[PDB]
Structures are given as C-alpha cells and as structure tokens.
Amino acid sequence: SQAEFDKAAEEVKHLKTKPADEEMLFIYSHYKQATVGDINTERPGMLDFKGKAKWDAWNELKGTSKEDAMKAYIDKVEELKKKYGI
C-alpha cells in the first residue's frame, strides 16, 4: 500500500487550486501519521497558529495505524483530485 501512498503524495502536489483549510489539515495530519506514526514532537508556541493547527490535527489521529492513515490519505487525495483537478 506504500506504493499507492507514495503516488498520492506526488499527485497531491499538482492540485490546480488551494483546497479548504480543513482539507489541507486532513492531508497534513494523515501524511505525518502515515510516515512518522503517532505524534512525537513538541507543540509549537507563541504566535505560530499555522503550526499549532497542524500539530493539533496530527495529535487528533493518535492511535491510528499507518495502514489506515495511508488509506485515508489516498482516498482524500482522490477526492481532491476530482474536486480541484490535477
């Protein structure tokens, strides 16, 4: 399934337009969950709200298996490809 994941990770780089914030966070959180696994970093501080939003989204997936993370990521990329086009 890693092959399909790596392909989706490449195609998502070609979306024709900027997706919604929640779609972006879904892609980010599942990408990290699928590559690193459970969140293992310190939450950003100060005024880095962009970083805080991403950290929190990944944190919410704690406990999700890499296999499930990859599947959800791939399905989301397919969803975005159709919605915004590649």
Side-chain angles (χ1 to χ4, degrees):
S1 310
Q2 181 73 231
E4 300 163 358
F5 175 74
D6 296 324
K7 181 178 181 183
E10 271 304 310
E11 306 193 308
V12 80
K13 291 161 57 178
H14 294 64
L15 290 188
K16 296 172 183 170
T17 54
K18 185 180 182 61
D21 194 59
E22 21 285 306
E23 294 173 322
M24 174 283 284
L25 291 177
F26 187 104
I27 294 299
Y28 173 80
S29 59
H30 288 75
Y31 175 73
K32 300 302 295 194
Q33 191 61 33
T35 56
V36 175
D38 290 327
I39 188 159
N40 65 337
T41 58
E42 296 287 60
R43 186 169 187 273
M46 304 157 263
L47 305 196
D48 183 18
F49 299 119
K50 180 177 65 158
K52 285 176 173 173
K54 281 185 173 68
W55 194 92
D56 290 338
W58 178 13
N59 186 63
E60 286 297 296
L61 298 181
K62 180 184 296 189
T64 299
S65 72
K66 288 179 180 176
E67 247 300 313
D68 288 333
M70 293 189 270
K71 177 186 62 185
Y73 180 89
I74 299 158
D75 294 340
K76 183 60 65 178
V77 170
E78 289 302 324
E79 190 185 313
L80 298 186
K81 283 168 57 182
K82 309 174 180 179
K83 183 169 181 179
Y84 303 111
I86 288 296

